Symmetry: C4
Subunit: 332 residues, 4 copies
């Protein structure tokens, strides 16, 4: 009558490996990755998550690099999605060095259809995604509003494609509408929430005030036309108006105020100054929010990882050294 995902009982090797991957015990993971050639690294815990997922979820960077050194690894895309969703920057910039993300071939790609074609890349528990099918890395990065990850995914040449019209009549949109209505509406609202984020507006365009105003008007039209999610499509336009008002408020000089209120070389330079000012201001105001439990969980896990590394390092130190002095003590 029990709910258990792992139907097969877990061996002692997989148990020590998964607790070591959960609590960042780096050197015994090195030992298990080297000496044990019967160690299935695609093992799952009681919930059904991989050692890479357990390593990413607790912010251990070193074991994530060490696991990415292996090549039989799976569910890497969901590890990237989880690291974006919690906002671990170095884990994202280490996962993006995997060969599956070499040319950007999986980051935000509409010609390789994620929802229509069973690509099966972003997946966990071989049965479904951790988010919607329409959610791609840069959409989730815009949803979580973390600026360094958005800039890294933009430097990889991945962007958010604007959704189609409310009645586009092309057979792709008609087929995606006919297969599921609620999923299609959720895809549209998720892509528009990704488009209306201050991170993507600040880092993706060249005239962010113009793009923000056009998006606000377009979201108001899709608000009053569409009946499902009729209020959230107005909240996104309110977020765009909030973004352009925050750009107005961060101006110091009267030249900056006139450059925003006019919009029209010099304008490119003053917009590149104001975008940087707004990014640093929003970074401070994200650093001035109250503290949730997950950050202390990260700190306690990093402390335990430090404990394991230092204890084993000094133990292997005294063994490797006392061997070489034992050779003396026997030799002399």
């Amino acid at each position: 009558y029990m709910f258990s995902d792992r139907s097969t009982s877990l061996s002692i090797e997989e148990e020590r490996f998964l607790d070591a991957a959960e609590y960042g015990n780096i050197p015994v993971v090195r030992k298990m990755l080297e000496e044990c050639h019967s160690l299935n690294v695609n093992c799952v815990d009681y919930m059904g998550q991989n050692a890479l997922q357990l390593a990413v979820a607790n912010e251990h960077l070193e074991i994530t690099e060490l696991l990415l050194k292996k090549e039989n690894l799976s569910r890497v895309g969901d590890a990237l999605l989880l690291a974006i969703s919690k906002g671990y920057v170095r884990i994202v910039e280490a996962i993006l060095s995997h060969p599956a993300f070499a040319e950007g071939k999986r980051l935000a790609t509409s010609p390789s259809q994620s929802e229509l074609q069973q690509d099966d890349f972003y997946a966990y528990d071989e049965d479904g995604t951790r988010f919607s099918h329409d959610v791609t890395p840069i959409i989730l990065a815009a949803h979580c509003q973390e600026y360094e990850i958005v800039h890294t995914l933009l430097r990889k040449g991945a962007r958010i494609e604007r959704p189609h019209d409310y009645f586009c009549k092309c057979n792709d949109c008609n087929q995606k509408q006919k297969h599921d209505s609620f999923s299609h509406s959720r895809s549209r609202i998720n892509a528009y929430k990704g488009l209306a984020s201050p991170a993507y507006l600040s880092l993706s365009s060249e005239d962010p005030v113009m793009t923000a105003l056009e998006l606000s008007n377009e979201l108001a039209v899709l608000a009053n036309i569409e009946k499902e999610f009729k209020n959230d499509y107005k909240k996104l336009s309110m977020q765009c108006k909030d973004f352009v008002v925050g750009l107005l408020d961060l101006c110091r000089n009267t030249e900056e105020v006139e450059a925003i209120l006019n919009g029209d070389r010099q304008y490119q330079k003053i917009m590149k100054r104001l975008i940087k000012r707004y990014v640093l201001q929003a970074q401070i105001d994200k650093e001035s929010d109250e503290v949730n439990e997950g950050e202390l969980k990260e700190i306690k896990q990093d402390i335990s990882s430090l404990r394991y590394e230092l204890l084993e390092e000094k133990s292997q130190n005294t063994e490797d050294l006392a061997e070489l002095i034992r050779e003396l003590g026997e030799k002399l």
Copy 2:
């Protein structure tokens, strides 16, 4: 006129051992457990708590394993109850390797009556329990709503037995009613709060929506019938309705919505997907609560434990090494 539990004044050995067990000083606890054969490990502090209780209450895993290596230890069940009540996962999974919990013979057992028979296992200060007598580990795990501990205690084959009817007329229930009324009503409301937790509902049944609805109706009937705790029995049914509404809200596909709203292979697979989705969502929303003082207390105690371990380890390192180079310096 002073209140003091330990009537006997504490020796210097017991003082150093209890401060070392309070602040996680691992190696001097190893030294006191080895070199001192007159060390009563059942010593109590000023409050009256054991070294195992002081070690569990501050989250020191290593000294908890080290104390469980000993065999004259007492009050292990209350250490398990305290580790469940604060939610230390590794301490629970290390305490459950003790031989008193080998076959599950003490976890959630109604044929071995905890309230009626003086089992005296879950006890502190030889005079009473840290909770009610009806509180067993999985009931407290459902009360604290921690999912990994509930899954571990369920894998041990322990479950919450449903309480009897409001007038069962069997002589066990009549005797437990005649011995104490307030204690019996508290036992009933504690067991029903354990049954209505989202952790036990999500991890214990096969059709959680059906069990949640049946429990909500049963709790509404026991709400309007019983006069004592007349509102809390409605709050539990409101929690069950909140649980089934949260399951409805976490659906993505229209197939998932239809699978919840109908209830009737494919349904087993879609329920095993939705239960995992709800578990991960509730884990995130538990990780998004504000921070209390006890977590920082845990972090400071782990930092002090790390300090003691590293300082003594490098000190014993330089002594063990400088001895072997002193043998040279005298020999050559």
Copy 3:
């Protein structure tokens, strides 16, 4: 025009010593305490506080023990008051091993008058106290409501003496009234706030319900009689009523409820059980408050202390070892 307490500019020795005492740099403090015989350990910072005060204020236990090894130290009583006011338990139990607190001769002593006689023990900046003159350690411990410190100061045989009547007519009270009115009223309200704390009520008497009720009635009489602080004297009686209601609420058995509501061997045992239950419950509810900045300041200072200790320890390690291998490399 500048405000500066230290009129004499600070030498480089005193500067390195005071920054090392501020940030817990243990080994350079050992070096400065040993090799420098011209080091005035009563030096003050820019504010005017001693190295012991700076060491206590940031929770460094090791340098506090090291400074208490010295004997020319001053302002120890204010260090005890500061450690009580922030609630550092081990620093208090280490400061109470100083010879000035050997027999309890300074803890809570009315025959050695603190306000009338210029004892000059609890002092900083040679001009005044960090609190009122009537504030003694156990009064401040009752004000901060920390239970372990109250129990430690009670085991030292220090207690809070009840203030006199509103018109006592003894020449001591008349003289203390004639010297200052506002100071005398503040002394009375501070001593009554110390008497009405749940810590002192729970740890100081044998029948806490009777003492709490008598104190609540006495505080209501002094509320309606006295005009100055007319509402706070009612808030203390409300705190006493809150304490006895919390004792009523923590009862499990009907025997415990009847033992509270009656008050009259068996009653001594059941009160010693309920007092322990209330102490543990209030300790949990103190550990369930939100987090202030000072705890993170303590954690960051302990981290920096750990960094300094480990870095210097491994540096002195490699020097002490490489000397003894250099003797070889030159000898062979």
Copy 4:
């Protein structure tokens, strides 16, 4: 279409150096500063910030001292402004040992005009300041209300010059008014907010009650006269009234109350006592605010810095030692 400040793609040397400066990896920064003579230390990240700015923004003191050992460094004044704005005390007291702040020649200097003359000292991204041009270090220290930094900048002999009259008619004020109106009004309100801070009032004058009252009346006059920012000029006067009321509330003796309410040797001593009492009280009440995310970011970065230092130190330890025992093992 991408927004990127660093138009030149970053080399692998600059990448390893900037990630090492971001996450406090001290020894590889030592290695890159020594062995690489083609390392442009004025490199910028994706945002456009220097290695000194990235090192200051995450509170790494050791790499900040190490970078200040170099002499081709730029944007030091904005590093000082950032360290003041986040309130890192040791980083400020280490940056003020740079030769650009030797005699106080850049701290708060009106004869060397910061807004009128293009001094280009406090700058980032070669295009603008992180704050207004009128913002100098002690004005920002008064804005952030951190007392140790205000005292350090006051001991450097830097002060806040009072702004001119609302119509001063001198050609400097007329020219600064004619060049920009909004910038001039922002400069006036920023300087008056710096003057009305409790830190500058408590640490800069000799009779703080008189200065606070004169400033409150002057700010009320500039409130009712000036139309722009008409309410904030009243909020500053309300802050001055709050400051003098807090000084009244912190009095213990009736002599202290009479010394405040009169204002008129003995008065100098009692004001020097009350100013110290208010400073310590405001320091406690700043340490009793809720916790934001940036403090945990500082703690996690210090933990990672400790990890890097200890791991490399023990690695270089075992290499340097095993070389000298290898010389033996080959020699004997």
